Design a protein around this nucleic acid. Structure first.
Ligand SMILES: Nc1nc2c(ncn2[C@@H]2O[C@H](COP(=O)(O)OP(=O)(O)O)[C@@H](O)[C@H]2O)c(=O)[nH]1
Lengths: 38, 61, 666, 141
RNA sequence: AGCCAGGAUGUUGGCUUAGAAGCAGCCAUCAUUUAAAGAAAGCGUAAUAGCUCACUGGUCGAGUCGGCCUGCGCGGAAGA
C-alpha cells in the first residue's frame, strides 16, 4: 500500500482506477503493486 | 616454569601437564621439567634409547 | 536364552515415546538399560525378560542411535496417526536397515483428532518403501476408539478401561464395519505364504488359517527383513497397551532368534569366526554408555550377548590393550538398582567403576580373541569455539569435554595449538547446547560462548624488483653491517611443494657464501610474521642479487636483521592482500530443496560448480570462503526439512575483497 | 509429437558412454534412469558410427518402452565435425571465424535431406544457412 | 474488447556450454508456409514444464485506439 505521490504501471495487468476520488493502481500478478495518491 | 628438552612438541596453550625435578644451568629461572609418556602430552616418536624417558613404547622387535 | 527381549523404543520428537515407555513400565510390574517381564501366548506363557534399550531422543546426533541400534535386537517404531511418517522417522529408518535389525511400527495418537490408521500405512509404503501389515484396527473414530481387534487370533478387546486401562473384555467385530475392515483381513492371508509354499497350498486350496501358524509365517520375515508389522496404539489415553507387548512377544526375535555376529578377527588367517548364540561360549561384550551416577558411581554399561561371566574376572579388552576388573553388574527395574551377581547370556548389565572404558570398546572376559567391531562413523558438522569464564574452569570442562570426548564418539574436541580456545563439535543445534546445559547444571561451568577465528593467509601481487635494506650500525667497537638487495614474486599458487622458494643469485665475490643459506632462514623467520594483520603470509619466491659485507662487522645476526629491513620495504611495495581459506563443500538435497539450497549457497558467496543426479540425490558441489561460516548446517536444515547435511574439505585460496580487509582491525 | 511424458530435448554429447558429465542430472531428474538406457543405447549408437553428435528423439513413456528415433546431428554441432575448425564463435557479423563452401553444406545436409523433412532439398539447406551464419563460421559458395 | 481453438519454431543456435533449453547478459536477430507466428514482451522454473502475449483464425457486430496543444478542477497538501 504505497502512499507514493505518483502511480505508474509496472505489470501489464495493472489498471488505474478512480475509487472515492483517490487515484489507485492494483495488479493481480504480484499484489505488491498496490498504491495510492498518484 | 618448565622445559620440554627433547626434539618433539605437541602440548597446546591450554593443556594440562605434569612436573618433575630437573635443573638446567643454561636457563636462569627453570628448575622443573616435563613428563612425556604421561598425560595429555605425547612422547617423541622413534627415539629408541633412553626409552624409560620420553615414552616411545618399545619399537616393536 | 529364548525368553529375553532387547527392545528399543525409537521415535520422532513428540511422538509418544516417553509416554509409551511409562505404559510399558506400569504394566510389566503386575536410565538406559531398564528391565521388564511379560508372559506370552506365542511361547506358551513362560515369563519373558524385556531389556528395554533407551533410545536417544535427539536422533539428530546420529552416533548415539548407531550404538543403540546394534545393542537392540528388536525395535518398536513409534509413529503419529495425524502426521503420518516424519522426517526423523525416515532418519531412524536409515540407521535401522543399516544394521538389518527388524522392527514393528507403532501408530500412536489414535485418540487425537484427525487420526486415520490408513494415513500412516500409505505414508509407510510411499516414503519408506516398505510393505506394511495391519495387525489390529480401531473400532470407531478419534473419540469413539475403544476397541482393538487382533485379526490374527480373530478376537476383540474393548476399553471402558475402568481402572487406568488395564482390565479388558472380549467382543466380536460389530456389523457396521465388518466388510470394509475385512479387506485387510484379505491382506493377511496373501502376505503370509511366500516364505513357505505350504501356506501357498492353503490359499489356492481353501483352508482358512489358524492363530499360531500365521505367527510362524510372519515372524521369519521380521527375522530376515522382508515385511514390517504395524500396530495401533495410544499411550496417553491407554488403549491398546496390553496387545502392544503381545505384538512384541509374538513377532520380534530374541537373543537366540537373532543371527550371531559375523564379526572380523585380528589373528592368523583373517577369517570370519562367530560369536554364537550359545549361552556357554567364550564371552565377549560391547560397552556403549558411560554415565556418572548421583551416588552409585561411574556406570560402565555394556550389553551381555553371549557366554557366562562370574563377576570378578579380569578382562582382555584388546582395542586399548589393558586388563581391567569389575565392581558389580547393575540392572534397573523402574530405575530401581536391585543388584545381581549373575551375568546371563542375553541380558544387559551396567558395570561400575571401570576406569578407562571408552565408547565402542570390544571387551573379552575369558581372554579370547575378540569379534572386533569398529562403528564410530558419524562426523560432527559444526566448528564452534568456547569461552568459559575462568581458565581453571576451562580445563575442568576441558576435562568434562575430555570426558565428553570419551563418552560419546562424535562430540569430540579440538585442541587448538594456535588460538587459545577449543572447539566443541556436534551434528546439530540442540545437542551442542544440551551439553552446554549439562555442564551448566551438572558439571557447573557457565559459558558466554564465542565464535571462532579463521586461518587468514596472505599473498602479494605486484612485480616489485629493486627493494633493498641497509643497516650500518657500527656505533662502537664491534657492530653490524648488512646489505641484501631482495626481489620477490606474485608466485604460482599450487605447482611448487612449499609456498616460497629461494635461489642463490650472487654476481661476483660480493657476499660470503656461508651467510647465503642463513639469509633464507632469516626470511624463513620473517615470512609468517606479516605486518598487515599479524597473520602468516605465503606465496612469494624471493631471489637476492646484490650484497655487501665487512671485515670486522660480520655477525650473521646482522645478515638476518637487515634482510627483514629489506623485507619491511619489500612487503610494503608489492601491494599485498589477504588470502581467504576456501572450502570445498558438497550437499545432497533430495528433490524439493534445490531452489532453497542453491539460493542459500549463493548468498554464502559460493560459485556454481555443477551437480549430478544419483537415484534420488541432487548433489551440488561448490567452493565457499570461510569468513561467515558460523553455522551452515543449522541454516541448511532449516530450509531442507532437516534431511540434508554437508561434509567439506579445505582446498584453496582466492582474492579477498576489501570488507574482509576491513576485518583487519588492530 | 509429445511435450512432457518422459521427454528431454538434449543429450548431444556422444563422445563417451555414461553421459553424466556433459548432460547428467537432467536425465536422472526426469524419469529416464540410465540403467536400462545406456544398456540399450549402444545397441542403437554402434549401428551407424561413433565420434558423432546425436539428437535423441526419445519416444519413450511410463510403462518401460525404449522405442528409439534418431536424427541427423543438429546444425549447432553438425559443423564441429563437418567444417573441421573447432571454432564456434559468438560474433558472426563482426569477424570471419571460419570457412565453408556451400557444396560442403550440400553433402552434409543431403543426409539431413534424407533424415529430416522441412520441405525440399534447397529449401531444407536454406533452413540451415541462418543457423550456420549465427556462429561466425561463414559460408562462401 | 470478450467467448471456443492454436500460439504456427526446426533448436539443447553460439559463448563461459557448469544451467543459462524463446524469457542472465552480450552477438547475430536466418529460414520452414511465410493463411496467425518474433529463434522473442512478461510473470514464473536450480534447469524444463507450466500460465499467456504477440496475431482475433471462426463467432460476435459497431466505431475504436494511442499521442500533440490548450479551458477548468483532482492527488500532491500536517500544528498547537
Ligand atoms: N493426544 C495424544 N497425545 C499424546 C499421545 N502420546 C503422547 N502424547 C503427547 O505428546 C507429548 C510428548 O510425547 P513424548 O512422550 O514426550 O514424545 P517423545 O519426546 O518422543 O518422547 C506428551 O505431552 C503427550 O501428552 C497420544 O496417543 N495421544
Amino acid at each position: 500500500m504505497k502512499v507514493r505521490a505518483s502511480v505508474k504501471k509496472l505489470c501489464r495487468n495493472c489498471k488505474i482506477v478512480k475509487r472515492d476520488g483517490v487515484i489507485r493502481v492494483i495488479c493481480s500478478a504480484e499484489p505488491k503493486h498496490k498504491q495510492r495518491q498518484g | 616454569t618448565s622445559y620440554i628438552g627433547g626434539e618433539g612438541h605437541n602440548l597446546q596453550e591450554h593443556s594440562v601437564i605434569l612436573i618433575r625435578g630437573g635443573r638446567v644451568k643454561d636457563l636462569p629461572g627453570v628448575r622443573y621439567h616435563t613428563v612425556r609418556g604421561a598425560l595429555d602430552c605425547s612422547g617423541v616418536k622413534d627415539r629408541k634409547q633412553a626409552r624409560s624417558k620420553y615414552g616411545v613404547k618399545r619399537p616393536k622387535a | 536364552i529364548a525368553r529375553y527381549r532387547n527392545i528399543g523404543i525409537s521415535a520422532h520428537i513428540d511422538a509418544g515415546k516417553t509416554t509409551t515407555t511409562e505404559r510399558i513400565l506400569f504394566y510389566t510390574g503386575v536410565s538406559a538399560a531398564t528391565t521388564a517381564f511379560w508372559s506370552g501366548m506365542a511361547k506358551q506363557y513362560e515369563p519373558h525378560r524385556i531389556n528395554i534399550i533407551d533410545t536417544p531422543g535427539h536422533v539428530d546426533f546420529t552416533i548415539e542411535v548407531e550404538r543403540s541400534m546394534r545393542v537392540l535386537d528388536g525395535a518398536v517404531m513409534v509413529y503419529c496417526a495425524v502426521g503420518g511418517v516424519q522426517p526423523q522417522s525416515e532418519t531412524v529408518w536409515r540407521q535401522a536397515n543399516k544394521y538389518k535389525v527388524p522392527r514393528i511400527a507403532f501408530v500412536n495418537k489414535m485418540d487425537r483428532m484427525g487420526a486415520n490408521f490408513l494415513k500412516v500405512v500409505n505414508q509407510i509404503k510411499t516414503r519408506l518403501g516398505a510393505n506394511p501389515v495391519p495387525l489390529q484396527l480401531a473400532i470407531g473414530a478419534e473419540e469413539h476408539f475403544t476397541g482393538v481387534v487382533d485379526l490374527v487370533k480373530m478376537k476383540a478387546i474393548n476399553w471402558n478401561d475402568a481402572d487406568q486401562g488395564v482390565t479388558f473384555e472380549y467382543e466380536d467385530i460389530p456389523a457396521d464395519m465388518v466388510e470394509l475392515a475385512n479387506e485387510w483381513h484379505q491382506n493377511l492371508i496373501e502376505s503370509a505364504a511366500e516364505a513357505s509354499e505350504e501356506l501357498m497350498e492353503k490359499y489356492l486350496g481353501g483352508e482358512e488359517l489358524t492363530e499360531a501358524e500365521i505367527k510362524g509365517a510372519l515372524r521369519q520375515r521380521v527375522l530376515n527383513n522382508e515385511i514390517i508389522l504395524v500396530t495401533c496404539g495410544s499411550a496417553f489415553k491407554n488403549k491398546g497397551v496390553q496387545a502392544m507387548l503381545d505384538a512384541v512377544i509374538d513377532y520380534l526375535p530374541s537373543p537366540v532368534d537373532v543371527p550371531a555376529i559375523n564379526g572380523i578377527l585380528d589373528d592368523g588367517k583373517d577369517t570370519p569366526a562367530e560369536r554364537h548364540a550359545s549361552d556357554d561360549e567364550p564371552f565377549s561384550a560391547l560397552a556403549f554408555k558411560i554415565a556418572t551416577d548421583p551416588f552409585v558411581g561411574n556406570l560402565t554399561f555394556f550389553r551381555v550377548y553371549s557366554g557366562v561371566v562370574n563377576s570378578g574376572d579380569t578382562v582382555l579388552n584388546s582395542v586399548k590393550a589393558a586388563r581391567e576388573r569389575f565392581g558389580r553388574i547393575v540392572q534397573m527395574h523402574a530405575n530401581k538398582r536391585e543388584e545381581i551377581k549373575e551375568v546371563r547370556a542375553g541380558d544387559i548389565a551396567a558395570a561400575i567403576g571401570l576406569k578407562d572404558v571408552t565408547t565402542g570398546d570390544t571387551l573379552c572376559d575369558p581372554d579370547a580373541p575378540i569379534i572386533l567391531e569398529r562403528m564410530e562413523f558419524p562426523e560432527p558438522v559444526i566448528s564452534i569455539a568456547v569461552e568459559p569464564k575462568t581458565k581453571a574452569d576451562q580445563e575442568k570442562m576441558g576435562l568434562a569435554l575430555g570426558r565428553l570426548a570419551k563418552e560419546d564418539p562424535s562430540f569430540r574436541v579440538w585442541t587448538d595449538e594456535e588460538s587459545n580456545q577449543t572447539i566443541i563439535a556436534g551434528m546439530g543445534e540442540l545437542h551442542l547446547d544440551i551439553i552446554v546445559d549439562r555442564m551448566k547444571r551438572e558439571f557447573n561451568v557457565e559459558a558466554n560462548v564465542g565464535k571462532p577465528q579463521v586461518a587468514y593467509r596472505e599473498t602479494i601481487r605486484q612485480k616489485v624488483t629493486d627493494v633493498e635494506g641497509k643497516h650500518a650500525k657500527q656505533s662502537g667497537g664491534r657492530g653490524q653491517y648488512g646489505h641484501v638487495v631482495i626481489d620477490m614474486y606474485p608466485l604460482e599458487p599450487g605447482s611448487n611443494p612449499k609456498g616460497y622458494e629461494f635461489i642463490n643469485d650472487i654476481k661476483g665475490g660480493v657476499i660470503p657464501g656461508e651467510y647465503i643459506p642463513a639469509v633464507d632462514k632469516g626470511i624463513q623467520e620473517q615470512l609468517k610474521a606479516g605486518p598487515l594483520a599479524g597473520y602468516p603470509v605465503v606465496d612469494m619466491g624471493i631471489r637476492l642479487h646484490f650484497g655487501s659485507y665487512h671485515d670486522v662487522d660480520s655477525s650473521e645476526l646482522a645478515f638476518k636483521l637487515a634482510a627483514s629491513i629489506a623485507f619491511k620495504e619489500g612487503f610494503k611495495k608489492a601491494k599485498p592482500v589477504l588470502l581467504e581459506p576456501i572450502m570445498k563443500v558438497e550437499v545432497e538435497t533430495p528433490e524439493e530443496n534445490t531452489g532453497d539450497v542453491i539460493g542459500d549457497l549463493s548468498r554464502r558467496r559460493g560459485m556454481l560448480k555443477g551437480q549430478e543426479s544419483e537415484v534420488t540425490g541432487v548433489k551440488i558441489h561448490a567452493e565457499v570462503p570461510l569468513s561467515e561460516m558460523f553455522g551452515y548446517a543449522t541454516q541448511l536444515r532449516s530450509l531442507t526439512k532437516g534431511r540434508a547435511s554437508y561434509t567439506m574439505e579445505f582446498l584453496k585460496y582466492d582474492e579477498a575483497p576489501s570488507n574482509v580487509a576491513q576485518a583487519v582491525i588492530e | 509429437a509429445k511435450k512432457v511424458q518422459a521427454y528431454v530435448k538434449l543429450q548431444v554429447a556422444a563422445g563417451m558412454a555414461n553421459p553424466s558429465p556433459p548432460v547428467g542430472p537432467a536425465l536422472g531428474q526426469q524419469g529416464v534412469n540410465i540403467m536400462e538406457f545406456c544398456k540399450a543405447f549402444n545397441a542403437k549408437t554402434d549401428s551407424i558410427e561413433k565420434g558423432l553428435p546425436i539428437p535423441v528423439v526419445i519416444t519413450v513413456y511410463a510403462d518401460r518402452s525404449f522405442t528409439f528415433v534418431t536424427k541427423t546431428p543438429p546444425a549447432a554441432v553438425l559443423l564441429k565435425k563437418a567444417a573441421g575448425i573447432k571454432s564456434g564463435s559468438g560474433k558472426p557479423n563482426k569477424d570471419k571465424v571460419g570457412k565453408i563452401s556451400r557444396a560442403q553444406l550440400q553433402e552434409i545436409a543431403q543426409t539431413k535431406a534424407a533424415d529430416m523433412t522441412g520441405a525440399d532439398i534447397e529449401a531444407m539447406t536454406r533452413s540451415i544457412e541462418g543457423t550456420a551464419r549465427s556462429m561466425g563460421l561463414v559460408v562462401e559458395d
